[PDB]
Design a protein around this ligand. Structure first.
Ligand SMILES: *[C@@H]1O[C@H](CO)[C@@H](O)[C@H](O)[C@H]1NC(C)=O
Lengths: 50, 39
Protein backbone atom coordinates (compact mmCIF):
# COMPACT_ATOMS: atom_id res chain seq x y z
CA UNK A 1 0.00 0.00 0.00
CA UNK A 2 0.84 3.69 -0.21
CA UNK A 3 2.08 5.46 2.92
CA UNK A 4 -1.06 7.63 3.15
CA UNK A 5 -3.23 4.48 3.03
CA UNK A 6 -0.92 2.09 4.90
CA UNK A 7 -2.26 -1.44 5.34
CA UNK A 8 -2.88 -2.60 8.90
CA UNK A 9 -3.15 -6.33 9.59
CA UNK A 10 -4.15 -7.45 13.07
CA UNK A 11 -2.32 -10.64 14.07
CA UNK A 12 -3.89 -12.67 16.87
CA UNK A 13 -4.17 -16.24 18.27
CA UNK A 14 -1.13 -17.83 16.65
CA UNK A 15 2.55 -18.55 17.23
CA UNK A 16 4.93 -15.77 16.16
CA UNK A 17 8.43 -16.98 15.25
CA UNK A 18 10.57 -13.84 15.20
CA UNK A 19 13.91 -15.60 14.63
CA UNK A 20 12.95 -16.29 11.00
CA UNK A 21 12.72 -12.53 10.44
CA UNK A 22 15.79 -11.59 12.49
CA UNK A 23 18.10 -14.16 10.88
CA UNK A 24 17.04 -13.24 7.34
CA UNK A 25 19.65 -11.47 5.20
CA UNK A 26 17.00 -9.77 3.04
CA UNK A 27 16.24 -6.88 5.44
CA UNK A 28 18.23 -3.65 5.56
CA UNK A 29 16.60 -2.12 8.65
CA UNK A 30 15.47 -4.19 11.65
CA UNK A 31 15.41 -1.41 14.23
CA UNK A 32 13.42 -2.40 17.33
CA UNK A 33 12.21 0.29 19.75
CA UNK A 34 11.20 -0.59 23.29
CA UNK A 35 12.22 -4.27 23.05
CA UNK A 36 15.29 -6.28 22.03
CA UNK A 37 15.17 -8.96 19.29
CA UNK A 38 16.72 -11.65 21.51
CA UNK A 39 13.79 -11.75 23.97
CA UNK A 40 11.08 -11.44 21.30
CA UNK A 41 11.14 -15.23 20.86
CA UNK A 42 10.44 -15.61 24.62
CA UNK A 43 7.89 -12.88 25.45
CA UNK A 44 4.18 -13.11 24.67
CA UNK A 45 1.86 -10.34 23.47
CA UNK A 46 -1.89 -9.83 23.22
CA UNK A 47 -1.98 -8.56 19.62
CA UNK A 48 0.43 -7.65 16.84
CA UNK A 49 -0.25 -4.72 14.52
CA UNK A 50 1.50 -5.07 11.15
CA UNK B 1 -31.91 -25.54 4.20
CA UNK B 2 -30.41 -22.75 6.32
CA UNK B 3 -30.80 -19.52 4.34
CA UNK B 4 -31.64 -16.84 6.93
CA UNK B 5 -29.09 -15.14 9.21
CA UNK B 6 -30.53 -12.17 11.15
CA UNK B 7 -28.47 -11.76 14.31
CA UNK B 8 -26.40 -8.63 13.63
CA UNK B 9 -26.20 -5.52 11.47
CA UNK B 10 -22.51 -4.52 11.83
CA UNK B 11 -19.03 -5.60 12.93
CA UNK B 12 -16.52 -2.78 13.46
CA UNK B 13 -13.47 -3.62 15.64
CA UNK B 14 -12.56 -7.29 16.06
CA UNK B 15 -10.11 -8.48 18.71
CA UNK B 16 -10.45 -12.28 18.47
CA UNK B 17 -11.86 -14.81 15.98
CA UNK B 18 -11.92 -18.59 16.51
CA UNK B 19 -13.40 -21.23 14.17
CA UNK B 20 -13.64 -24.73 15.64
CA UNK B 21 -15.18 -28.19 15.29
CA UNK B 22 -18.97 -28.43 15.82
CA UNK B 23 -20.05 -29.01 19.42
CA UNK B 24 -23.39 -30.63 18.55
CA UNK B 25 -39.72 -36.78 21.90
CA UNK B 26 -36.50 -35.02 22.85
CA UNK B 27 -33.52 -37.23 22.00
CA UNK B 28 -30.43 -35.16 22.77
CA UNK B 29 -29.46 -33.49 26.03
CA UNK B 30 -26.82 -30.78 25.77
CA UNK B 31 -25.21 -29.40 28.90
CA UNK B 32 -23.01 -26.31 28.76
CA UNK B 33 -21.21 -24.26 31.40
CA UNK B 34 -19.96 -20.78 30.53
CA UNK B 35 -17.55 -19.02 32.90
CA UNK B 36 -15.73 -15.65 32.84
CA UNK B 37 -12.75 -15.97 35.20
CA UNK B 38 -9.70 -13.65 34.91
CA UNK B 39 -10.48 -12.88 31.27
C1 LIG C 1 -13.64 1.21 16.77
O1 LIG C 1 -14.47 1.50 15.61
C2 LIG C 1 -14.74 2.90 15.41
C3 LIG C 1 -15.63 2.99 14.20
O2 LIG C 1 -15.92 1.71 13.67
C4 LIG C 1 -13.43 3.67 15.24
O3 LIG C 1 -13.71 5.05 15.11
C5 LIG C 1 -12.52 3.44 16.45
O4 LIG C 1 -11.27 4.09 16.25
C6 LIG C 1 -12.30 1.94 16.65
N1 LIG C 1 -11.47 1.71 17.83
C7 LIG C 1 -10.50 0.78 17.87
C8 LIG C 1 -9.75 0.69 19.16
O5 LIG C 1 -10.26 0.06 16.92
Amino acid sequence: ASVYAWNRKRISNCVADYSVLYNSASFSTFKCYGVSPTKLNDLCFTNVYA
Amino acid sequence: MESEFRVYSSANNCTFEYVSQPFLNFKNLREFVFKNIDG
